[PDB]
């Protein structure tokens, strides 16, 4: 069915629920053919997070690229997970993604930048992290005074 | 090197007579051949035995070890032969192996070894090529 | 086969059975004191 | 102090110590102010007196000159700070890296500067970070990184460095992150990915860089995916004028 | 001279005395000496005077000998110089007519890495230039080579001196003979060139052309060397479900196991393997290729299953190959493992058939059956076949062969509910002929749960009720049993109700039923009469009842998983069992630091006094399984001297002569006494010098097994689990927390490690952790652990008892 060509047909022989391996192969040829349709479908059925999102992330709308970087989000794929939701000027879950990793910093630094003025309580949660994974002189409990800055200090 | 010691032993639990290509393997020839060549070489009658992560390659002669010992290959047939050119040249020079005699032709037997296998590549020898050396 | 019956029982069954069987959980006979008389003639044979 | 022989303390009176053994033979030793100044001293937290102190019948390696390196609010620490790790150390321990990325130079070693880079995002300014986490070679970290900051002069010197690497969670990420989708298209046509390149550049109106991966190599286009391909981009990058590499801070 | 480190002396004699064969005897023993490591400097002057000019070939190879072995070393004779006593007439030996000395020459000179000679080895190729044997132009370009290594990576090696300077490697590939020391960072030009050699090739010369330029577009073109190489290229081209059908690697591949049967028993593994790839599924683990050799055409002449049936094996080859070959059966057929086993099983399992596969050793037997049977309670066809063969297993109709076979039958009937009614008339036969236990445990079973099917019953229990043999476990067997299944469907002179009458009186009641019972006093003391007395609520009637029981299994029973079942064929199991699978004055302080992961004991050495200590030396020792890393090295201990001077450390080592206490570290000075004084800096303990093994969960029950760990104590600071103060204690007392040997609940749950240890003491060391830890309203002692312990005569099981409480130094000087 590879070598006919016939996507649809090596569709239903890989078999929608796993058959990861079968699938695998149908995406790279269905890129080839640059039916990205058939493709998007093969690598969510192969799942291949890393892969599926490069296809997928050339939205602009992210579309379906958030379920594929779901998990990414909390499990250090952070890389993968900011470009699913970073994609046409919304926060869909970018934020989201640095505090459950524990990039905290991140999600503030995120917050400064769009500015809805989310950042006091991220600066927070983050600071008092700081005093938590020691740090004394740079301790962060504050507002301005022990390094960071919450978001009175910060500005658009 | 690809070829640390070419070395003869007695599984007296020393390395009678051996050779260090460049100086690196001294004493250390002795303990790794008293030790080893005495199991057999930790060997079951098999030419190819490796422990303690250095390859030894041997035949047994007697109380006698005749031994190749690398840690690194380039080929399989090659090992083989360096040892068995060897156990060509060995009995012109000792009539079999037997550590007294092997003891008293250590000279001929070195030269044989630095000729053998020189800068641990193995190059050729022959009964006729050896007596040039020692002429 | 005796698990069987005995799980069955307790797992299973209203374990009046169990209940009644248990009365301290006892031996399956009690002898007099065997030991020391066997002993007696035992040791300097 | 240490004598010759295996010995029983006979007692203490004084500030000798008396001693004799099984065969019973004497030693006597009076109780020194060597190792019991220094740290009396030390506990009265002094250091000036501590110097004098330090003598080589009591120096040790981890008593003076590494012992002190044992404060998660450095005040010992501060002290003694000659080791390169006893300086990396210090660092952590205040929270303040600017020390931590010297001592992590100084200990040779790129783990250190991406561990120090990783402290001090969090004591808040990238700036730091981008510096270490460049040179332990995580330009990908800094791609994703650098929207969240808020620089794009940056945040587009990190695609290049990553282009190369052919890191496709690294390159990838800043033409998302500016608002015009270009950076990607040229990335991933070296990557060889043409298909990808299409649908990134053809979404933002960028179509004609899509059409042109598409003649270059395997064309159509055509084909409407589980995702847009032709269907607007645009994203407003950063409306923060001072940058999170700029993120304010005192210190304390 | 096999090894005498002094006899310079004898030597310097010998090695001038005006007869030539002295000389080269002891020049000879020189070299043997040095081989093994042993003293020579003081006779270089006699050496070096003998032999220098001349072409007399053996006194000049032996010098020429000695240079490469220790020339450095050596400066009496020597000195050093850039045409030093071992190349400045040896110049001579390059430029003599005679091939040998020239030859020797070149090869020792070159192949000095030295810069004392470097000079001298350069127009040294010009001794093999000019080639007179293989060896020569081999010699050659293994000595320009050698050149480039030393120190000539640029223009002092790399062009022609007069033929060869690095130019050979290019020669050799178009001359008669090839050799190429060009391996690695020579010249461009020889590397093309060792290509056209391939063709062209001399077969030593092309396994060195071959470690340099591999992968050919041919099938060969000849030779051991390239045939060598092409099996590797192979494999490339088709690596794809292991080889499946090995290349040219199944020649070297015998040798690997020459010791003897396991050779076959592999070679019978890949044979299986190829024939097919089925289901893989427990234990139908054949891959390779799917069709290759098929299996089972109906044309094939003679076909497949002839080779089938050798693997499957009562031992039919010897036991290596017999394991392998068990697993192999199941391997290629089976629907898992059940359907070639229960074939297999059927051979194996005692009948009436053949007397070479039935024996009167009743546990064998009995595992047999089990294993028949396993295959029913695992598949279900397998429960139609096992009946009838579990009845010819029977037929035997000694007291234990029945005996045996009647004992899984019924575990089967539990399983298999009013399936094997058939059964229970062919299982009364033999039940009177009795002089075992197992015969009545196993009969009463089967006839009393099978009632409704037969009517016989007190004719057949009762011979066996008045006749003897062994009884205790009898009683427990048949006392859940005999009523069983519908309450009055039986009668020969004795109905199903007198079978509850006499089921009653055998547990531990008394009646006249079936002429009275065998014995009513039951089995192990825990078991008793009573639970099943109060049962029969519903006289032997499937309802909730001894029948239900009866007609029902104890939790899941399925698979192979050993829930009514043993795991394969017994013997083949036997072996699985088996594998464990196991993975002057002087005063000290100090203190251990680390910096930048360097462990060192740090050492003060100080001198209070005022009188002279001159002659310092400080050395840290090497007692056993401790170890010096560096000692100290200041000559420190001088009068009023305070010093750091550290000593590094390591802990694992091997035994040395000198004592074996604490930490031995020694201070020199002046006292011609007491020379050498030993003190001491903190403390380090006999502990480290067991070896730190681990076990699993087998390894620990043999060991358990193969020597006592009764003994125990109550270590205090166990109130922690295993993980915290007691792994770490136990880890200085180089031991490890492993595999569990516990058995957790809402009573039950102390935590319990499987300890193991090799220690260098002759023993290894093993212990358990149990930790008290309350999980009952009347804990031992609360929180604490015991650890009971061993070692292998315990003299470590002790350590282990005590180094588990509580273990820290430190000093803050």
């Not at chain 2, 690196?24 to 190819?48: C, D, S, V, W, Y």
Request: charged share 25%; proline share 4%.
């Amino acid at each position: 069915a590879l070598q006919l060509g016939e996507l649809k047909i090596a569709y239903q022989l890989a078999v929608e629920a796993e058959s990861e391996q079968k699938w695998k192969q149908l995406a790279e040829l269905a890129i080839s053919k640059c039916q990205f349709s058939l493709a998007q479908e093969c690598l969510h059925h192969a799942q291949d997070y890393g892969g599926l999102l490069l296809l997928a992330t050339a939205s602009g709308n992210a579309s379906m690229v958030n379920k594929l970087a779901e998990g990414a989000e909390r499990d250090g794929k952070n890389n993968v997970a900011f470009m699913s939701y970073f994609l046409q000027g919304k926060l869909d879950a970018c934020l989201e993604l640095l505090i459950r990793t524990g990039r905290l910093p991140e999600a503030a630094f995120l917050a400064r930048t769009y500015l809805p003025s989310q950042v006091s309580r991220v600066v927070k949660l983050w600071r008092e992290n700081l005093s938590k994974v020691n740090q004394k002189a740079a301790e962060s409990l504050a507002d301005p005074t022990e390094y960071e800055n919450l978001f009175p200090g910060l500005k658009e | 090197m690809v070829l640390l010691a070419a070395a003869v032993c007695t599984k007296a639990g020393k390395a009678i007579v051996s050779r260090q290509f460049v100086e690196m393997t001294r004493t250390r020839i002795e303990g790794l051949l008293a030790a080893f060549p005495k199991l057999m070489n930790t060997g079951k009658q098999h030419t190819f035995v490796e422990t303690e992560s250095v390859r030894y390659v041997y035949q047994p002669m007697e109380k006698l070890y005749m031994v190749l010992i690398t840690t690194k290959n380039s080929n399989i047939l090659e090992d083989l032969e360096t040892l068995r050119l060897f156990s060509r040249v060995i009995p012109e020079y000792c009539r079999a192996l037997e550590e007294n005699e092997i003891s008293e032709h250590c000279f001929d037997l070195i030269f044989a070894f630095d000729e053998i296998v020189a800068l641990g590549y193995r190059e050729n020898v022959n009964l006729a090529q050896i007596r040039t050396f020692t002429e | 086969d005796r698990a069987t019956f005995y799980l069955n029982v307790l797992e299973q069954k209203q374990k009046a059975l169990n209940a009644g069987y248990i009365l301290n959980g006892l031996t399956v006979s009690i002898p007099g004191l065997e030991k020391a008389l066997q002993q007696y003639t035992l040791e300097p044979s | 102090r240490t004598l010759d022989l295996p010995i029983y303390v006979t007692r203490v009176k004084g500030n000798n110590v008396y001693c004799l053994d099984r065969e019973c033979r004497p030693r006597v030793l009076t109780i020194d102010p060597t190792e019991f100044k220094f740290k009396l001293a030390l506990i009265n937290r002094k250091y000036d007196e501590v110097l004098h102190m330090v003598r080589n019948a009591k120096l040790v390696g981890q008593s003076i000159i590494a012992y002190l390196q044992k404060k998660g609010y450095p005040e010992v620490a501060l002290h003694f700070v000659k080791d390169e790790k006893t300086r990396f150390s210090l660092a952590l321990e205040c929270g303040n890296i600017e020390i931590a990325l010297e001592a992590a130079k100084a200990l040779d070693d790129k783990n250190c500067w991406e561990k120090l880079g990783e402290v001090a995002l969090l004591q808040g300014n990238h700036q730091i970070v981008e510096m270490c986490y460049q040179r332990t070679k995580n330009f990908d970290k800094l791609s994703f990184l650098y929207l969240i900051t808020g620089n794009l002069e940056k945040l587009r010197k990190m695609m290049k460095i990553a282009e190369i690497r052919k890191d496709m969670s690294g390159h990838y990420q800043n033409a998302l992150y500016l608002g015009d989708v270009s950076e990607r298209v040229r990335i991933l046509k070296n990557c060889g990915q043409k298909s990808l390149a299409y649908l990134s550049a053809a979404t933002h109106g960028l179509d004609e860089e899509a059409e042109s991966l598409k003649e270059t190599f395997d064309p159509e286009k055509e084909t409407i995916p589980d995702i847009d391909p032709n269907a607007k981009l645009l994203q407003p990058p950063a409306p923060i004028m001072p940058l999170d590499t700029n993120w304010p801070l005192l210190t304390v | 001279m096999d090894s005498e480190p002094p006899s310079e002396i004898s030597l310097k004699n010998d090695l001038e005395k005006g007869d030539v064969k002295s000389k080269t005897e002891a020049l000879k023993k020189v070299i043997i000496m040095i081989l093994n490591g042993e003293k020579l400097p003081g006779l270089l002057m006699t050496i070096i005077r003998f032999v220098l000019p001349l072409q007399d070939h053996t006194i000049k190879k032996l010098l020429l000998v000695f240079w490469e072995i220790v020339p450095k070393t050596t400066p009496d004779g020597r000195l050093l110089h850039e045409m030093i006593l071992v190349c400045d007439a040896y110049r001579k030996d390059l430029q003599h007519p005679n091939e040998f000395i020239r030859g020797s020459t070149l090869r020792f000179l070159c192949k000095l890495k030295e810069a004392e000679l470097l000079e001298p080895l350069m127009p040294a190729i010009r001794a093999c230039l000019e080639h007179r044997h293989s060896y020569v132009r081999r010699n050659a370009v293994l000595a320009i080579y050698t050149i480039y290594r030393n120190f000539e990576h640029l223009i002092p090696d790399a062009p022609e001196l007069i033929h060869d300077f690095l130019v050979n490697e290019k020669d050799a590939s178009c001359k008669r003979n090839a050799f190429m020391m060009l391996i690695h960072a020579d010249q461009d030009r020889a590397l093309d060139y060792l290509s056209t050699c391939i063709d062209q090739v001399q077969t030593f010369g092309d396994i060195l052309q071959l470690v340099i330029v591999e992968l050919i577009y041919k099938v060969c073109h000849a030779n051991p060397s390239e045939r060598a190489r092409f099996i590797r290229c192979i494999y490339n081209l088709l690596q794809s479900s292991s080889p499946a059908v090995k290349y040219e690697a199944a020649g070297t591949l015998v040798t690997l196991s020459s010791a003897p049967t396991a050779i076959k028993a592999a070679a019978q593994c890949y044979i299986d393997l190829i024939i097919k790839e089925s289901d893989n599924n427990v234990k139908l683990i054949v891959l390779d290729r799917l069709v290759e050799l098929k299996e089972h055409p109906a044309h094939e002449r003679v076909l497949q299953d002839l080779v089938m049936d050798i693997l499957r094996v009562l031992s039919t080859p010897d036991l290596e190959v017999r394991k392998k070959t068990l697993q192999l059966a199941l391997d290629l057929v089976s629907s898992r493992n059940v359907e070639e086993l229960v074939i297999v099983l059927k051979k194996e399992v005692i009948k009436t058939n053949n007397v070479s596969e039935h024996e009167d050793t009743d546990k064998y037997r009995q595992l047999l059956v089990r294993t028949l049977h396993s295959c029913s309670v695992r598949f279900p066809d397998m429960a139609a076949n096992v009946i009838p063969v579990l009845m010819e297993f029977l037929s035997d109709s000694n007291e234990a062969a029945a005996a045996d076979v009647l004992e899984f039958v019924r575990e089967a009937i539990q399983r298999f509910d009013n399936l094997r009614m058939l059964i229970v008339e062919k299982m009364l036969e033999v039940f009177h002929a009795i002089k075992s236990v197992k015969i009545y445990r196993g009969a009463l079973w089967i006839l009393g749960e099978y009632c409704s099917t037969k009517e016989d019953i007190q004719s057949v229990m009762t011979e066996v009720r008045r006749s003897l043999g062994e009884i205790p476990i009898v009683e427990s067997e048949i006392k859940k049993e005999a009523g069983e299944l519908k309450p009055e469907e039986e009668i020969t002179v004795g109905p199903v109700q007198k079978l509850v009458t006499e089921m009653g009186t055998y547990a531990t009641q008394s009646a006249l039923s079936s002429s009275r019972p065998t014995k009513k006093e039951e089995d192990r003391p825990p078991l008793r009469g009573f639970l099943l007395d109060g049962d029969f609520f519903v006289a032997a009637s499937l309802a909730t009842t001894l029948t239900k029981i009866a007609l029902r299994y104890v939790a899941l029973v399925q698979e192979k998983k050993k829930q009514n079942s043993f795991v394969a064929e017994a013997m083949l199991l036997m072996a699985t069992i088996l594998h464990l699978g196991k993975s002057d004055p002087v005063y000290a302080e100090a203190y251990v630091h680390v910096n930048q992961y360097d462990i060192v004991l740090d050492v003060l050495v100080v001198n209070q006094t005022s009188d002279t200590l001159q002659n310092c030396t400080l050395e840290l020792a090497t007692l056993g399984d401790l170890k010096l890393v560096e000692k100290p090295s200041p000559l420190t201990l001088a009068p009023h001297d305070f010093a750091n001077i550290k000593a590094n450390v390591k802990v694992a080592s091997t035994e040395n002569g000198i004592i074996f206490g604490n930490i031995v570290y020694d201070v020199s000075g002046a006292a011609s006494d007491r020379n050498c004084v030993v003190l001491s800096d903190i403390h380090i303990d006999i502990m480290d010098y067991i070896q730190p093994a681990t076990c699993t969960d087998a390894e620990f029950r043999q060991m358990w097994a193969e020597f006592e760990w009764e003994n125990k104590v109550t270590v205090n600071t166990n109130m922690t689990d295993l993980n915290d103060y007691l792994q770490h204690i136990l880890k200085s007392t180089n031991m490890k927390c492993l595999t569990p040997e516990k058995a957790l609940s809402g009573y039950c749950g102390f935590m319990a490690a499987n300890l193991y240890a090799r220690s260098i003491f002759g023993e290894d060391a093993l212990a358990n952790v149990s930790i008290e830890k309350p999980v009952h309203q009347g804990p031992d002692a609360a929180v604490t652990g015991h650890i009971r312990i061993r070692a292998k005569s315990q003299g470590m099981a002790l350590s282990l008892g005590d180094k588990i409480n509580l273990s820290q130094k430190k000093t803050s000087l």
